[PDB]
Structure 1
Amino acid sequence: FVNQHLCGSHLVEALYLVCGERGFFYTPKT
């Protein structure tokens, strides 16, 4: 689940599940 390399949709989906109703921001170019 979390403790791996997560990229692209895989990363977005992990954020979705962890953050739940808090929501999240995805900013790949920082």
Structure 2
Amino acid sequence: FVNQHLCXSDLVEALYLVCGERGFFYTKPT
């Protein structure tokens, strides 16, 4: 719907509305 940068509250925005209110976890490998 945009095909742009997906980072912070942006990549988060999606993740939140994308995931499905089931929490998530980006990179931060331990």
TM-score normalised per structure 1: 0.48
TM-score by length of 2: 0.48
Greater helix share, structure number: 1
Higher relative contact order (CA 8 A, sep 6+): 1
